[PDB]
Write a protein that binds this ligand. Structure first.
Ligand SMILES: CC(=O)N[C@@H]1[C@@H](O)[C@H](O[C@@H]2O[C@@H]([C@H](O)CO)[C@H](O)[C@H]2O)[C@@H](CO)O[C@@H]1O
Ligand SMILES: [Cl-]
Ligand SMILES: [Cl-]
Ligand SMILES: [Cl-]
Ligand SMILES: [Cl-]
Ligand SMILES: [Cl-]
Ligand SMILES: [Cl-]
Length: 129
């Protein structure tokens, strides 16, 4: 599923991501924009053999099981395929664990490089929230 900008903002808010760990909704929407372009089915292969899955490009190195990342962890206790669903529940629940791990949203490369410090409220501008 390719979410609209305001559509994703509403879904993230319902699942309690807004202001989660102090990160405003615009931060989360911006992260999803640059990680996946709002596409729940996005996947990308990393140099080490791990893969990033879904709207927030969550990495199998630490967070989910795909059966093809030797030595990796599954800290969200989920199959990576669950992060590709049209329903964002699994991705949100895992994102909550990730952002609580110590380094906040810096875990998302695209957030650090393209969202951090910018006018992130622009991403929820005009949305009915
Ligand atoms: C929270 C999350 O999963 N973020 C991922 C990044 O982990 C991922 O960055 C890759 O992770 C490194 C190793 O694969 C794991 O140590 C790679 O060196 C690095 O490229 C990023 C890739 O675009 O996507 C999300 O931000
Ligand atoms: Cl957009
Ligand atoms: Cl915001
Ligand atoms: Cl594995
Ligand atoms: Cl599994
Ligand atoms: Cl949803
Ligand atoms: Cl980047």
């Amino acid at each position: 599923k390719v979410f609209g900008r305001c559509e994703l903002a509403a879904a993230m808010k319902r699942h309690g991501l807004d202001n989660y760990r102090g990160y405003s909704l615009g931060n989360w929407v911006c992260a999803a924009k640059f990680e996946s372009n709002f596409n729940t089915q996005a996947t990308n292969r990393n140099t080490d053999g791990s893969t990033d899955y879904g709207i927030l490009q969550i990495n199998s190195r630490w967070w989910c099981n795909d059966g093809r990342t030797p030595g990796s962890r599954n800290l969200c206790n989920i199959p990576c395929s669950a992060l590709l669903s049209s329903d964002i529940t699994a991705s949100v629940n895992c994102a909550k664990k990730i952002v609580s791990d110590g380094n906040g949203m810096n875990a998302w490369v695209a957030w650090r490089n393209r969202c951090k410090g910018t006018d992130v409220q622009a991403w929820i501008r005009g949305c009915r929230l």
